[PDB]
Amino acid sequence: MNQVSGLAGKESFILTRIELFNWGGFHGLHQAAIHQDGTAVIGPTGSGKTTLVDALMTLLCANPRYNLASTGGHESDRDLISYVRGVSGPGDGGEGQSHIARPGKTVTGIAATLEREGKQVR
Amino acid sequence: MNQVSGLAGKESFILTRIELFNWGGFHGLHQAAIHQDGTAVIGPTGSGKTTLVDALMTLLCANPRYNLASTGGHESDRDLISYVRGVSGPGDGGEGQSHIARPGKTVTGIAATLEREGKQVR
Amino acid sequence: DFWDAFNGLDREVLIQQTLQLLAKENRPVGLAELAELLPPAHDLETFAVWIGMAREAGIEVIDSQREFAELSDGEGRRWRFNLPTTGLESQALMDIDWE
Amino acid sequence: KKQYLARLRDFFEVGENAFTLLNRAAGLKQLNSIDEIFRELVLDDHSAFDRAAEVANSFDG
Amino acid sequence: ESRTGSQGGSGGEKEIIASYVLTASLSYALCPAGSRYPLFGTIILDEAFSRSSHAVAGRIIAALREFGLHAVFITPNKEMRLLRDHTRSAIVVHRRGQNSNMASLSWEELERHYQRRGNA
Amino acid sequence: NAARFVDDNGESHYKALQVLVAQLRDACERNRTLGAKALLDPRFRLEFAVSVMDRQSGNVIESRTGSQGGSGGEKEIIASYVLTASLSYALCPAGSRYPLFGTIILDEAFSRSSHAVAGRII
Numbered sequence: 001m002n003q004v005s006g007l008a009g010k011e012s013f014i015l016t017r018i019e020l021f022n023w024g025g026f027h028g029l030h031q032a033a034i035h036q037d038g039t040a041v042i043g044p045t046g047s048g049k050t051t052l053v054d055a056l057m058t059l060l061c062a063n064p065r066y067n068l069a070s071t072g073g074h075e076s077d078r079d080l081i082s083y084v085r086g087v088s089g090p091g092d093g094g095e096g097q098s099h100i101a102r103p104g105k106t107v108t109g110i111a112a113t114l115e116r117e118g119k120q121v122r
Numbered sequence: 123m124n125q126v127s128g129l130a131g132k133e134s135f136i137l138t139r140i141e142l143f144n145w146g147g148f149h150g151l152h153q154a155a156i157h158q159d160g161t162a163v164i165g166p167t168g169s170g171k172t173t174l175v176d177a178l179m180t181l182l183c184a185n186p187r188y189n190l191a192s193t194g195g196h197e198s199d200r201d202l203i204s205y206v207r208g209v210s211g212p213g214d215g216g217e218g219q220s221h222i223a224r225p226g227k228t229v230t231g232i233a234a235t236l237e238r239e240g241k242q243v244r
Numbered sequence: 245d246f247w248d249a250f251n252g253l254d255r256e257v258l259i260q261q262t263l264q265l266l267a268k269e270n271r272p273v274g275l276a277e278l279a280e281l282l283p284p285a286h287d288l289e290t291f292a293v294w295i296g297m298a299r300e301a302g303i304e305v306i307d308s309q310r311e312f313a314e315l316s317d318g319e320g321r322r323w324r325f326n327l328p329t330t331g332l333e334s335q336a337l338m339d340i341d342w343e
Numbered sequence: 344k345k346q347y348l349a350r351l352r353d354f355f356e357v358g359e360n361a362f363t364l365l366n367r368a369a370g371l372k373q374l375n376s377i378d379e380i381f382r383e384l385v386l387d388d389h390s391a392f393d394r395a396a397e398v399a400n401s402f403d404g
Numbered sequence: 405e406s407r408t409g410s411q412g413g414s415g416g417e418k419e420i421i422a423s424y425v426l427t428a429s430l431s432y433a434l435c436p437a438g439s440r441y442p443l444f445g446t447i448i449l450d451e452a453f454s455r456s457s458h459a460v461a462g463r464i465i466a467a468l469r470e471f472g473l474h475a476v477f478i479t480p481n482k483e484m485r486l487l488r489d490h491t492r493s494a495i496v497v498h499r500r501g502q503n504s505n506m507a508s509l510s511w512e513e514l515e516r517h518y519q520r521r522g523n524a
Numbered sequence: 525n526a527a528r529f530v531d532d533n534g535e536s537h538y539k540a541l542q543v544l545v546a547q548l549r550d551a552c553e554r555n556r557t558l559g560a561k562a563l564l565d566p567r568f569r570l571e572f573a574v575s576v577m578d579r580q581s582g583n584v585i586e587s588r589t590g591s592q593g594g595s596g597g598e599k600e601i602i603a604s605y606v607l608t609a610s611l612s613y614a615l616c617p618a619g620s621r622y623p624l625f626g627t628i629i630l631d632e633a634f635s636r637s638s639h640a641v642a643g644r645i646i
């Protein structure tokens with residue numbers, strides 16, 4: 001079981017970090033580490049998980065399909081503009097025109113680190 | 123909390139027993155007892171839960187859509203002939219007929235009993 | 245609810261303890277006997293596994309003969325499970341491979 | 344972003360199809376018979392529904 | 405809120421409302437003409453709750469209870485806690501070789517008490 | 525093709541081309557009918573089927589030639605395995621059997637399969 005665990009990170013680049021700044025609902029600077037033997041992102045539904053997946057997919061793809069998990073089959077509801085602005089369409093109760101978390105001048109950075117035998121690619 | 127649960131039977135009919143004979147992968151005679159307070163059908167994948175529900179649905183609906191849960195509302199996966207013959211899997215590509223368990227003269231029986239204040243209808 | 249879902253029946257540990265118990269007793273044990281010897285912390289969740297045991301190894305289980313088992317959960321409420329009659333044996337169980 | 348994606352392709356020695364499939368892998372929930380998994384998950388669209396319109400207009404001329 | 409104000413987290417309230425509305429529709433469809441209770445009160449739903457959380461799933465089970473619908477829930481050994489709390493029987497179905505088979509099981513709460521020799 | 529050889533100043537050729545373009549436009553207008561998709565979509569002109577065989581015995585042991593005929597768990601297993609193989613092939617640089625980008629993200633991958641079959645997918 002453990003012996004195979006060491007294969008990953010030897011012949012391939014494995015993700016080992018994610019950093020976000022004012023991305024989606026992740027206001028401020030957040031950092032999440034990833035284990036070389038697989039990792040699980042867990043929490044109450046609708047906290048941040050699909051936001052993390054979408055940030056990574058944005059880092060990777062040209063026209064990422066946001067919320068492909070639930071909106072698969074039809075057009076995605078989200079977009080890059082919403083994530084940068086941090087709209088909270090779903091979350092309401094006193095919604096003041098979608099709760100644009102950052103309406104004014106803003107900056108959002110997303111960084112992903114990948115490692116292989118001590119070589120880093122961010 | 124248990125006082126409300128007594129409403130079953132006192133108001134209308136509720137299913138209580140399912141009888142199967144040569145249905146799908148259920149070789150021989152099989153009987154299932156359904157509690158008046160609600161029941162759960164559990165078991166690993168590759169089991170009879172969908173088959174058991176399909177028998178009952180065939181009993182009720184004129185045109186049943188078999189394997190609706192897995193098909194997701196699309197074209198019905200199976201049919202009455204397949205369940206009667208007990209077909210298990212596509213069955214290879216060299217004939218063989220090993221997938222079919224009742225290729226020759228055979229009979230299947232499916233029964234369902236409903237209770238209402240003692241009165242029973244099968 | 246996150247916390248409740250965090251802790252659940254880890255069936256590999258249950259399988260290991262069950263097969264060790266069967267090897268120790270080395271006798272055909274009924275479901276209620278197993279529950280008495282092995283206190284399930286999840287009630288029916290454990291029982292199904294044991295049933296999955298009996299029918300995985302070919303040990304026929306009889307529903308006509310209904311045994312019983314009285315178990316108290318965490319909050320103290322006591323429940324009477326009307327388990328069927330089984331013939332769990334250690335040899336056959338250790339024979340069959342576990343995923 | 345085009346130049347950045349080209350740089351990623353060069354570094355990881357994989358075409359755009361690999362990363363597009365990686366993105367589509369997160370929508371695997373809505374799956375069905377092998378046909379739909381193959382025609383909607385892997386082997387990206389590459390359909391020719393748009394070129395047909397251009398051909399039709401040219402033929403109208 | 406004339407319009408549904410918000411959810412319980414990623415379609416929580418939306419899912420609850422949709423499930424409640426569909427349950428009401430089923431109850432009305434099964435309720436005979438000029439009848440308050442459905443004559444055919446048993447409902448079968450394969451894959452009871454594969455996309456629904458425990459907090460919501462309890463809500464749909466309560467809704468099914470309220471409208472006088474006796475439901476049998478089919479699950480692959482998942483979500484056992486809420487099924488056990490909200491049901492009183494279980495049909496363990498297992499398939500070996502080319503043949504499947506069933507085995508019934510049941511349980512019931514003894515009247516006894518919540519707990520004895522302690523706070524009541 | 526037959527009309528291209530007629531000596532009539534491009535009249536029969538024009539008529540045949542008109543028929544072909546009419547077919548193309550008919551397909552384009554109904555851009556989601558099965559016929560139109562098969563006509564104008566590369567991945568719709570051919571079917572797809574899976575076959576489980578024996579490691580040493582090359583004969584097909586179970587051939588799902590489309591043949592939906594499967595429980596939700598079985599279909600989920602097949603789809604997860606096929607997607608895993610496709611991802612492995614895609615991320616592997618040409619001529620190499622070890623992917624260089626070794627990270628893959630799954631989002632609610634398993635929901636219809638038992639805990640015993642999910643471990644096999646992992």
Ligand SMILES: Nc1ncnc2c1ncn2[C@@H]1O[C@H](COP(=O)(O)OP(=O)(O)O)[C@@H](O)[C@H]1O
Pocket residue numbers: 024025045046047048049050051052069070078079082083086087088089090091413414
């Ligand atoms: N760009 C956005 N647009 C809309 N809502 C957003 C956005 N970013 C965050 N949110 C909100 O934050 C939460 C994100 O939920 P999330 O975890 O990502 O989905 P999932 O249930 O699949 O895990 C939701 O309540 C959502 O309303």
Ligand SMILES: Nc1ncnc2c1ncn2[C@@H]1O[C@H](COP(=O)(O)OP(=O)(O)O)[C@@H](O)[C@H]1O
Pocket residue numbers: 146147165166167168169170171172173200201204205209210211212480593594595596597598
């Ligand atoms: N018409 C059929 N064709 C092929 N296999 C079938 C057919 N009817 C039943 N089966 C088999 O019986 C089982 C029915 O699926 P089932 O286990 O009950 O659903 P679930 O995945 O939720 O557990 C499957 O293993 C399936 O292979």
